[PDB]
Amino acid sequence: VYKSIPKNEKYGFVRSIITLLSKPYHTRQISSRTNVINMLLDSISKIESLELPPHLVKYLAISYNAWYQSINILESIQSNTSIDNTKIIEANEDALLELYVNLQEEDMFYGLWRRRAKYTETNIGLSYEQIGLWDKAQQLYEVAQVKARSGALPYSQSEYALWEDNWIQCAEKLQHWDVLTELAKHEGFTDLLLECGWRVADWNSDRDALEQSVKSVMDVPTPRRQMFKTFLALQNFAESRKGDQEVRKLCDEGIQLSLIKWVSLPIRYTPAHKWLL
Amino acid sequence: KMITKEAGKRGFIFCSVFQARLNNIPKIPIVTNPESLKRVKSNNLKTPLEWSQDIMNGFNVPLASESHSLPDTDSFYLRMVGIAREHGLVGTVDARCVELISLALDQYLKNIIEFTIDTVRYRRKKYSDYSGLYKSVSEMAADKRDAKIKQLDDDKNEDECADEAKSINNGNNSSKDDIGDISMSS
Amino acid sequence: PRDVRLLHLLLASQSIHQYEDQVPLQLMDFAHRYTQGVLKDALVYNDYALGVEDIRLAIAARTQYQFKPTAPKELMLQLAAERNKKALPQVMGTWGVRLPPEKYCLTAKEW
Amino acid sequence: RPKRLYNFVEDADSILKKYEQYLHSFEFHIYENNYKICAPAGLILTKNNETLKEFLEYVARGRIPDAIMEVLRDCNIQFYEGNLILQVYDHTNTVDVRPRVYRTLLKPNDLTTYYDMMSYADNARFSDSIYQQFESEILTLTKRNLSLSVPLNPYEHRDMLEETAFSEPHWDSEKKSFIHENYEQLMLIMNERTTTITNSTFAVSLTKNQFSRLKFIEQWRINK
Amino acid sequence: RSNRPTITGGSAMNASALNTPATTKLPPYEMDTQRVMSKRKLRELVKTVGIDEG
């Protein structure tokens, strides 16, 4: 019945489709496996004419489940003659790579990145990072960062973040925590919280300096920051006996947070479920 | 009393070059006083590294001579927070005084435009209880700039409206800011 | 009055030895109105928040539109530089005085 | 009575011709669609903005902008008799073997002297008459080349002159006469970049209540 | 809102399931305000001052 919509009227129809999908009352179907958003995105994916919606909406229609209903849409623009812009294609690739990161499918992430990258040192660093050689990948990301400060290429504002964050990930794997501690002191960031192990034997002389860092960021909570709050309560029970036994409450709210995060993922086991385990 | 007065009663300045310098320079608020330091640290207001960026972002607004349109809420907000950081106010600018500034500009320009409009014409149907279309020129907004001179800020703006708004007929006004050179004829 | 002869000494202090009679009367009736307006606006500004910074606010409120502005040389230099960009036009070479065009002269007008 | 014969230049072309075979003061570059204003030897590279579109109106009129004076004093560049030499490189019309080199001169105004005095007023704390005397002495020592020489006045030697070299009014018949004269913006609605999780947390929390990283890593490797 | 496309999604670690909020919704956005946006406002101000009015 989409065929009844004629030409010179598809723009208003697709705009009304975005207006319908972007409604705020769909949160009364977030805790469901059979949302109207799945039933509607699946019918969007069988059209190939309007099957390009704004496509950072598809990546944000992940508050619902809709993972593969969105990956179908975002991969049917990679193989479409939709070349009206070079900034629609790179934003499509951004949303697809972020869905691959949220599903922890890293091989597709590295394949799509070094299919879309413009520098060559980015390709070499991503290949060494996929294999697991993080020293050479870290050196190649430094080389790619240097050649963009004094070069003739515009680096697209999406490879730059890749160089920064993947340098931080390689330095985390190589356990250079003394560099990253002052890097997280140089700018406001919970990389500072992720030195829970920082060549440390006390965790008590700077207890307040960690409690303020947790409490400033323990709104819009994640399972990791909730784990940090529970460990602070556990250390409070440890160093001061006859403590709280709120650790028995913080562990339970962390288990409930992790269960909400488990139901938000696909039913079948993805690599992202391993961190929840 | 008057066998006692002298020079050296004040702590002022009077060098007009130095007054123009201090009116020209951009100044950022700093802290040395400890009570005001604990007063500004409690209300989560930041260090001067944010107020200097706020000076720069309040200056970098496309001010309304360049855009040829009346400004909007974000431009008003950024310019007023830059000005409030210039004067010393390290707090937050309220969101209703921007709309108050908007209505102030409204009634100011409406007064100026109305007392320019009712001078090129005598509206017979108005101003009474029982010809065509005119465009106001810059010579008219200089001519009723002086017949009713009270309506202005008396700042730079009226000085430039008196000094540079009237153009002689070889002025080359419809230009691109550079074609009035002598070498563009040769 | 004390201020008539104080104005006599003030005028003589700036080498003004010839003046009329109602000139210190005019100076006193200026100073009365100026101080009354300044103190009324300062009473408003003190009910808002007397003191000296209150007087400073009340005399900075009305400096902005009546008396002689302060250090106007750099704004006038900027304005002169905007006017002195344009090179001078071509002049007549017939050694006399040339008028503007006839519509820009006070002759083709009617009552 | 003067002691020697002096040769002082107060033009643009003569000062430029005198100051060829000398190192320049600025170094401006015209690349494709972007520009760069560097020093002769972190130097910024600009997009097509409006500060540059007003600086370019001060190089087709060969004068220094009044804003720059103090910072030129800060940046230790070479002045040349009050002027500074802008060397422009047009890289769009380069030749193969080097871009197209122009070498223009910018001239001081009254505004440049006033802004130099206003920036002198920061750490000197002089009065007004010292600035008057300083300006008078510099206007003496730097403004030579005066055209003070009077020709004949044509209005007194009227009897030895052609008759129609003047223009007086004449009386005509009964009057007298003087002499006169869409889709791309729809497909990117949610495309707003986020630097980090903490910044996203702060951006969603306050609503209800550059290569600095590489430079930091380099300076921390230097400090060790 | 998270538009970073790098591994770890602009987070300290690469778990990506532990560094993501539990229940989210769509961010605020706006359509093309071209029709409701006027290039010139001073013409509207003189329009509300100077009308025909016969």
Side-chain angles (χ1 to χ4, degrees):
Chain A
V1 302
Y2 174 58
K3 314 298 188 50
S4 53
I5 302 296
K7 315 300 292 177
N8 292 317
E9 213 170 2
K10 310 291 200 185
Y11 186 80
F13 188 69
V14 73
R15 217 153 50 87
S16 80
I17 279 180
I18 305 147
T19 300
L20 172 71
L21 286 159
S22 288
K23 283 300 181 52
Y25 53 80
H26 297 303
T27 77
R28 282 187 263 171
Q29 286 171 353
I30 276 178
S31 201
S32 192
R33 292 291 201 193
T34 323
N35 321 324
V36 178
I37 302 299
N38 301 331
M39 296 150 57
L40 197 59
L41 282 186
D42 196 19
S43 69
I44 298 322
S45 307
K46 308 275 182 311
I47 279 166
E48 277 83 49
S49 177
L50 68 88
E51 206 200 3
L52 284 60
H55 72 80
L56 270 296
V57 188
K58 312 289 101 167
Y59 156 68
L60 267 304
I62 289 305
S63 43
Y64 322 103
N65 280 112
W67 292 94
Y68 299 101
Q69 292 96 325
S70 298
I71 286 172
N72 192 11
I73 285 170
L74 292 174
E75 284 182 7
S76 279
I77 313 175
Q78 306 255 352
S79 279
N80 191 18
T81 305
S82 171
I83 302 96
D84 292 288
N85 291 268
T86 46
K87 47 201 305 186
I88 281 182
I89 307 301
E90 60 95 19
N92 180 28
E93 288 180 328
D94 282 357
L96 196 50
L97 286 161
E98 289 153 47
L99 275 194
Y100 288 163
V101 161
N102 285 139
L103 277 197
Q104 273 276 94
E105 312 280 348
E106 295 184 339
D107 278 28
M108 294 283 272
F109 169 84
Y110 289 125
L112 185 54
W113 251 115
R114 72 168 156 270
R115 278 293 289 185
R116 77 164 285 201
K118 296 205 304 307
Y119 278 69
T120 53
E121 298 99 355
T122 297
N123 280 59
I124 310 170
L126 284 164
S127 284
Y128 281 137
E129 202 202 332
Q130 188 166 12
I131 290 314
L133 308 152
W134 292 291
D135 217 357
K136 311 185 169 176
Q138 194 178 6
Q139 296 164 356
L140 263 294
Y141 286 140
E142 284 184 55
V143 166
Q145 268 173 307
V146 159
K147 296 300 181 180
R149 290 167 36 185
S150 51
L153 276 81
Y155 61 80
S156 56
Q157 216 60 36
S158 179
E159 280 184 285
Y160 169 65
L162 165 78
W163 296 329
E164 292 187 322
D165 278 8
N166 285 33
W167 193 96
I168 291 183
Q169 195 251 1
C170 295
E172 263 199 352
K173 296 306 190 77
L174 286 179
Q175 296 171 233
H176 297 167
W177 301 111
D178 53 5
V179 185
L180 258 55
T181 311
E182 67 177 71
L183 180 57
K185 280 178 175 182
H186 204 64
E187 59 181 0
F189 188 31
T190 68
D191 203 17
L192 183 77
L193 274 190
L194 262 294
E195 289 99 14
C196 81
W198 52 288
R199 312 295 171 268
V200 57
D202 49 0
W203 198 256
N204 290 139
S205 87
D206 48 355
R207 163 74 70 88
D208 43 354
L210 297 159
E211 281 157 318
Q212 304 323 304
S213 312
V214 162
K215 282 303 163 295
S216 69
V217 79
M218 261 296 290
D219 44 355
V220 301
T222 79
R224 187 57 167 177
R225 316 197 278 232
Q226 163 60 45
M227 263 196 279
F228 280 125
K229 168 187 182 60
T230 313
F231 180 65
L232 278 183
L234 173 80
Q235 284 293 102
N236 174 47
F237 171 71
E239 72 167 344
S240 88
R241 72 179 57 193
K242 185 212 69 52
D244 283 89
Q245 303 306 103
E246 203 72 33
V247 191
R248 298 202 161 201
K249 281 85 181 173
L250 291 194
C251 294
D252 296 12
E253 83 187 44
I255 283 170
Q256 284 298 122
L257 196 68
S258 294
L259 289 189
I260 298 173
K261 205 70 205 62
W262 188 280
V263 181
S264 76
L265 276 172
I267 290 182
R268 212 187 311 262
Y269 181 87
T270 57
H273 286 126
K274 191 152 73 174
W275 291 97
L276 296 182
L277 295 176
Chain B
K1 163 198 64 164
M2 73 183 52
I3 65 163
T4 319
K5 330 170 177 299
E6 64 184 85
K9 185 181 178 292
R10 311 133 191 94
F12 295 169
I13 61 176
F14 52 91
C15 170
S16 61
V17 180
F18 187 69
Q19 304 190 46
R21 169 63 167 170
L22 295 188
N23 204 61
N24 220 29
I25 194 166
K27 58 208 88 68
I28 56 171
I30 72 160
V31 286
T32 292
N33 177 262
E35 182 259 354
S36 184
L37 180 83
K38 309 305 172 57
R39 187 195 42 88
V40 78
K41 203 170 61 184
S42 89
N43 291 270
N44 91 309
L45 310 170
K46 273 78 69 177
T47 204
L49 274 299
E50 288 63 29
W51 310 325
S52 87
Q53 286 211 342
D54 209 322
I55 290 301
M56 190 181 182
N57 295 327
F59 271 129
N60 285 338
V61 179
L63 80 166
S65 296
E66 319 170 341
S67 67
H68 308 284
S69 69
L70 301 164
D72 280 28
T73 296
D74 47 351
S75 61
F76 278 158
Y77 178 77
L78 284 157
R79 268 164 58 80
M80 285 154 79
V81 180
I83 279 149
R85 292 310 188 274
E86 279 278 37
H87 285 254
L89 259 56
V90 300
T92 77
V93 162
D94 182 89
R96 308 216 48 86
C97 50
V98 168
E99 192 210 8
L100 185 57
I101 284 286
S102 280
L103 203 54
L105 283 180
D106 264 4
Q107 299 201 198
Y108 184 60
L109 283 176
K110 277 157 106 175
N111 202 36
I112 296 183
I113 285 161
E114 176 76 86
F115 277 162
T116 317
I117 274 174
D118 50 13
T119 67
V120 297
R121 202 191 308 263
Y122 176 63
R123 298 179 266 194
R124 213 269 317 271
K125 300 283 188 172
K126 213 195 173 175
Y127 300 122
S128 198
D129 49 354
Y130 166 69
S131 197
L133 174 135
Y134 296 153
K135 46 179 201 75
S136 301
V137 310
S138 175
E139 283 105 357
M140 189 51 65
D143 277 344
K144 312 302 164 247
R145 188 264 302 155
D146 69 84
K148 281 157 267 280
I149 180 168
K150 80 197 74 53
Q151 312 208 88
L152 269 146
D153 202 7
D154 307 303
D155 212 5
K156 179 254 201 187
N157 46 43
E158 189 259 346
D159 273 346
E160 307 272 12
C161 178
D163 279 20
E164 296 180 351
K166 315 161 305 304
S167 293
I168 46 176
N169 295 318
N170 54 4
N172 186 38
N173 45 31
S174 178
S175 85
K176 281 94 189 172
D177 266 334
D178 207 52
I179 65 168
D181 277 345
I182 55 153
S183 317
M184 317 312 171
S185 316
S186 306
Chain C
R2 176 182 164 259
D3 285 303
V4 167
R5 64 185 69 92
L6 270 172
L7 274 174
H8 195 121
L9 267 299
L10 177 59
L11 282 150
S13 65
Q14 315 277 302
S15 315
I16 303 163
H17 303 304
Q18 278 103 29
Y19 41 86
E20 291 184 354
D21 50 323
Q22 289 169 148
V23 173
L25 187 54
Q26 255 171 335
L27 288 200
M28 284 179 320
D29 296 358
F30 150 76
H32 154 266
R33 218 174 44 183
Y34 174 65
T35 323
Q36 177 157 354
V38 155
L39 281 164
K40 187 177 299 196
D41 301 336
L43 272 179
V44 166
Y45 289 156
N46 198 28
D47 280 15
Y48 184 62
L50 53 90
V52 60
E53 323 293 326
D54 168 40
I55 294 293
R56 290 190 36 169
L57 267 296
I59 70 179
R62 43 175 76 242
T63 300
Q64 301 184 327
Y65 72 96
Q66 54 185 359
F67 285 95
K68 191 61 72 190
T70 320
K73 195 188 151 149
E74 64 98 11
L75 176 70
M76 281 313 152
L77 272 181
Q78 291 272 12
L79 203 156
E82 311 309 308
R83 180 62 83 95
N84 305 6
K85 287 321 196 314
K86 320 282 178 182
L88 293 159
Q90 308 299 321
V91 68
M92 206 183 52
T94 316
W95 274 339
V97 161
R98 186 161 56 167
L99 292 196
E102 194 46 80
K103 51 165 164 172
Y104 298 96
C105 302
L106 315 168
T107 304
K109 292 179 194 297
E110 182 261 359
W111 283 98
Chain D
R1 296 292 93 195
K3 303 172 55 184
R4 292 171 180 174
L5 187 65
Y6 296 132
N7 41 4
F8 295 145
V9 283
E10 309 282 325
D11 273 324
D13 293 330
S14 83
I15 290 189
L16 272 175
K17 185 158 57 194
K18 175 200 210 312
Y19 264 103
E20 293 204 64
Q21 296 192 358
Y22 266 97
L23 182 52
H24 48 108
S25 283
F26 271 33
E27 205 167 13
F28 186 65
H29 302 262
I30 297 185
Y31 294 114
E32 72 295 333
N33 86 88
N34 80 303
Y35 302 97
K36 176 191 174 197
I37 314 183
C38 63
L43 311 108
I44 66 158
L45 299 97
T46 76
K47 180 272 179 184
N48 299 112
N49 57 336
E50 289 321 291
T51 301
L52 212 51
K53 213 186 278 289
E54 294 178 354
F55 166 66
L56 286 191
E57 300 161 21
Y58 285 123
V59 297
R61 292 164 168 156
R63 55 178 84 193
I64 319 179
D66 48 307
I68 324 179
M69 278 291 125
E70 47 192 4
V71 85
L72 301 167
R73 183 203 307 182
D74 306 328
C75 297
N76 210 29
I77 67 163
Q78 294 273 87
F79 268 79
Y80 289 125
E81 279 78 1
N83 310 266
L84 56 93
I85 303 186
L86 179 73
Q87 219 189 31
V88 186
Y89 295 78
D90 182 52
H91 285 263
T92 305
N93 290 333
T94 173
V95 73
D96 52 354
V97 296
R98 35 176 52 181
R100 188 138 170 87
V101 183
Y102 304 81
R103 215 201 173 107
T104 176
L105 198 80
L106 304 103
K107 291 177 296 279
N109 285 100
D110 40 11
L111 267 175
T112 72
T113 64
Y114 199 87
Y115 272 66
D116 220 325
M117 281 159 218
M118 280 201 298
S119 62
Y120 280 157
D122 289 347
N123 56 324
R125 206 184 329 260
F126 290 149
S127 50
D128 176 84
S129 297
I130 314 294
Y131 293 145
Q132 286 271 289
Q133 290 183 55
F134 176 56
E135 191 212 357
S136 199
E137 218 284 341
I138 294 307
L139 272 172
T140 289
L141 285 201
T142 72
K143 287 256 189 173
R144 302 292 92 193
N145 289 45
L146 292 164
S147 178
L148 50 96
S149 293
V150 186
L152 267 76
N153 192 257
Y155 282 107
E156 44 199 9
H157 312 274
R158 275 191 171 198
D159 282 86
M160 48 191 75
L161 259 187
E162 40 169 358
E163 314 96 347
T164 70
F166 304 105
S167 176
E168 285 88 3
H170 330 99
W171 170 260
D172 309 327
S173 87
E174 301 173 7
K175 277 175 291 298
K176 69 173 59 199
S177 313
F178 314 92
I179 186 79
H180 292 114
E181 285 199 346
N182 195 25
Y183 162 73
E184 187 189 334
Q185 297 93 13
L186 178 62
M187 294 278 296
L188 316 188
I189 44 163
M190 312 232 173
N191 174 55
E192 298 184 354
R193 308 200 148 264
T194 74
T195 283
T196 169
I197 34 160
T198 60
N199 294 351
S200 318
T201 293
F202 294 157
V204 304
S205 88
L206 270 70
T207 196
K208 65 163 171 33
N209 299 87
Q210 58 267 352
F211 283 80
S212 77
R213 197 161 289 172
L214 187 66
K215 186 184 62 93
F216 186 81
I217 296 311
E218 284 182 306
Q219 73 165 9
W220 169 237
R221 285 176 185 174
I222 287 312
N223 286 319
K224 297 161 57 60
Chain E
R1 180 165 323 181
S2 90
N3 196 4
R4 207 154 245 211
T6 85
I7 210 141
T8 71
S11 148
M13 76 166 176
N14 69 341
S16 155
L18 305 182
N19 291 113
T20 319
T23 319
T24 68
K25 55 187 174 178
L26 265 69
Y29 80 108
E30 51 174 281
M31 297 300 213
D32 272 359
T33 319
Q34 296 173 90
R35 48 291 168 290
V36 100
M37 266 352 302
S38 261
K39 228 332 132 130
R40 78 302 184 273
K41 304 197 55 198
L42 190 70
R43 320 189 294 215
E44 327 293 323
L45 200 44
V46 190
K47 223 176 305 176
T48 190
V49 175
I51 327 171
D52 192 18
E53 295 186 349

